[PDB]
Amino acid sequence: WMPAYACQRPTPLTHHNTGLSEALEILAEAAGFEGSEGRLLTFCRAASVLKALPSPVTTLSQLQGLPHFGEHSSRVVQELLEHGVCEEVERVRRSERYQTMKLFTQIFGVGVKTADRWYREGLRTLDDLREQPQKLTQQQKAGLQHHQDLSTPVLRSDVDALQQVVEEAVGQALPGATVTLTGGFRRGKLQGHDVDFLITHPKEGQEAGLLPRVMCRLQDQGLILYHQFERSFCIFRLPQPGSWKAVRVDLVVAPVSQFPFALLGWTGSDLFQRELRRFSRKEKGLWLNSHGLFDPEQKTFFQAASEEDIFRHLGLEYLPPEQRNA
DNA sequence: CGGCCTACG
DNA sequence: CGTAG
DNA sequence: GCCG
Ligand SMILES: [Mn+2]
Ligand SMILES: [Mn+2]
Ligand SMILES: [Mn+2]
Ligand SMILES: [Mn+2]
Ligand SMILES: [Mn+2]
Ligand SMILES: [Mn+2]
Ligand SMILES: [Mn+2]
Ligand SMILES: [Mn+2]
Ligand SMILES: [Mn+2]
Ligand code: NA
C-alpha cells in the first residue's frame, strides 16, 4: 500500500505535504538534540511517508494504516489540520534550547554532544564561541570562520564552476580519472549546503593515492581554505566576480569495483540510504555500505556494475536519483 | 524487549 | 568525538 | 516513537 521502508517507494523532490512534514521534522530534530535517535528516526520516517503521498492530506482519516503514524505523529497532524498550528511544535521552535542547539549544530565540526556541552556551559551565540577559541578544534575554527558563507545556499552555477576545477585537478593528478557529481544535486536539488563529488578510474587500483595528489593540486591553485585518505571534507575558496566565497565540498575516491556502491550511498538521501541499509540487513540478510554488499553466510561480495544491479539484487524496484528524496 | 546505517577522519 | 549520504 |  504505502510500503514501510523509504527505499520501497518513490519520493519526488516536490511533494504535497510540506506543512505537515516540516512540523514532524522539527520534532525529529528536537529529539536528536535530546539524544533520542529512535524518536528522531520515527518522526523522520513519518515525515517521509507524507512526502511520498500523491495528494495533500486534508483529513485525519487519510493517515489510517500509514506506516510510522501512531498516536503522537497522528496528533501533530490532527492539530495542524484543525488549527493550522501544533502547540508542541511551536513550543519547541520558540525555545531557547532548540534555537541554540540548531545554531551550534549547523556549524561544521559541531554535533549534538558538543553543542549540548556548550549550551550547559551557558554559551548561546556564535560570538560566545569565538571569544573562547581555545575550546575549538581546527575543524570547528574553520566552520566558525566561514560560517556566513557556508550558510548561503550553493547554486548550480557554483556546482558547475567547482566541477570544472575539480575535473582539472583530477586530470592533472591521474589521466583517465573521472569526476561524478553526487549528493543532493544528483537527485535534482537546485540548491544545497555543499557539493559532493565521487572520483574513480576505470582501471582497478590506479586510483590508489589519488586524493592527496588532487588536494595538493587544488591547494597550489589557491582553491582550498580548509582540509584535514579516501574522503576529504573541504572548504574551497570559490572565485566570484571581483571576489570569492567559501563553499563546502566533499571529495571521495573509490576503486571502480566499489563505484556503484559509493555512487548509491553518496547520492542519498540520508534517510533513503539508512532505510536501504536497514532493509538489506533486516529483510534480505545482506550487509550494505558504500564499499559493497556482503552475504555473511557465503562470505562473498556482490559484484555490481550499476546502481540498478544493487537494487536487483536486494529485490527492490529501481528508483532513479530524483525519486530518492526520502 | 530492544533496534534504530555503517562507514571514514 | 567529528564527518557523509 | 514506532514496530518487529
Ligand atoms: Mn506529485
Ligand atoms: Mn507521545
Ligand atoms: Mn483541537
Ligand atoms: Mn551534499
Ligand atoms: Mn575504503
Ligand atoms: Mn557533502
Ligand atoms: Mn524499549
Ligand atoms: Mn547530508
Ligand atoms: Mn521510546
Ligand atoms: Na555540525
Q: Among A202, A221, A256, which residue terminates a domain?
A: A256
Kindly provide the resolution of this structure in angstroms, with one decimal.
1.4
Identify the burial level of A141 via C-beta atoms within 10 angstroms of its C-beta, where 0-12 means exposed, 13-18 middle and 19 or more buried.
middle
Do residues A129 and A85 both lie within one domain?
no
Residue tagged active-site, from A149, A250, A295, A309:
A250
Q: Among A241, A256, A271, which residue terminates a domain?
A: A256
User: A6 and A48 in contact (C-beta within 8 Å)?
Assistant: yes
Do residues A279 and A232 both lie within one domain?
no
Question: Within 13 Å of residue A30, how many CA atoms lie on the same side as its CB?
Answer: 19
> Residue A27 in 3-state DSSP?
helix
Q: Where are the beta strands (DSSP E) in chain A?
A: 154-155, 178-181, 191-192, 195-200, 224-226, 231-240, 243-253, 287-288, 293-295, 300-301
CA A7, CA A200: separation in Å to the nearest integer?
Answer: 26
Q: What is the Cα A29 distance to its own chain's centre?
A: 14
Residue pointed to by grid coordinates 531557547:
A96
Strand A300-301 vs strand A293-295: parallel, antiparallel, or unpaired? antiparallel
Task: State the DSSP H helix or E strand holding residue A132, giving kind and residue range, or none if neither.
Answer: none
Q: Is A194 known to sit in a ligand binding site?
A: yes
Burial A311-324 (b: 16+ CB within 10 A, else e): bebbebeebebebb
CA A145 vs CA A110, A115, A149, A155, A222: distances in Å: 13, 17, 9, 21, 17
Identify the burial level of A114 via C-beta atoms within 10 angstroms of its C-beta, where 0-12 means exposed, 13-18 middle and 19 or more buried.
middle
Q: Which residues pair with A250 in a beta bridge?
A: A196, A233
> Residue A18 in 3-state DSSP?
helix
Do residues A225 and A295 both lie within one domain?
no
**Could you tell me the three cell numbers for A23?**
512540523
Q: What is the Cα A226 distance to its own chain's centre?
A: 20
CA A97, CA A326: separation in Å to the nearest integer?
Answer: 27
Q: Among A95, A117, A141, which residue terminates a domain?
A: A95
DSSP labels, A223-251: -EEE----EEEEEEEEEETTEEEEEEEEE
CA A310, CA A281: separation in Å to the nearest integer?
Answer: 14
**Could you tell me the three cell numbers for A260?**
556503484
CA torsion angle A23 A27 A32 A37 (round to 10): -100
CA A100, CA A115: separation in Å to the nearest integer?
Answer: 8
DSSP labels, A42-88: HHHHHHHHHHHSSS---SGGGGTT-TT--HHHHHHHHHHHHHSS-HH
Nearest nt (C1') from A37 Cα: B4
User: A287 and A22 in contact (C-beta within 8 Å)?
Assistant: no
A220 in catalytic set: no
DSSP at A175: T
Tell me which protein residue sits closest to nucleotide B3, measuring alpha carbon to C1'. Answer: A38
CA A122, CA A64: separation in Å to the nearest integer?
Answer: 44
How many domains, in total, are found in chain A? 4
A5 touches strand D (CB under 7 A): no
CA of A166 to the centre of ligand 6 (A): 15
CA torsion angle A76 A78 A80 A81 (round to 10): 160
Q: Is A116 known to sit in a ligand binding site?
A: no
**Could you tell me the three cell numbers for A257?**
569495483
Do residues A167 and A251 both lie within one domain?
yes
Amino acid at the residue A92: V
CA A144, CA A236: separation in Å to the nearest integer?
Answer: 15
CA A233, CA A147: separation in Å to the nearest integer?
Answer: 15
> Residue A31 in 3-state DSSP?
helix
Domain that holds residue A276: 257-325
For residue A305, the tally of other CB atoms under 10 A from its CB is 11
Do residues A21 and A73 both lie within one domain?
yes
Do residues A91 and A105 both lie within one domain?
no
Find all residues with CB under 8 Å of A12, minimum gap 6, and list them.
A51, A322, A323, A325
Output phi, psi for A111, to 5 deg: -110, -170
CA A205, CA A256: separation in Å to the nearest integer?
Answer: 8
User: A35 and A97 in contact (C-beta within 8 Å)?
Assistant: no
Question: Within 13 Å of residue A289, how many CA atoms lie on the same side as its CB?
Answer: 3
Identify the burial level of A171 via C-beta atoms within 10 angstroms of its C-beta, where 0-12 means exposed, 13-18 middle and 19 or more buried.
middle
Do residues A91 and A109 both lie within one domain?
no
Do residues A226 and A314 both lie within one domain?
no
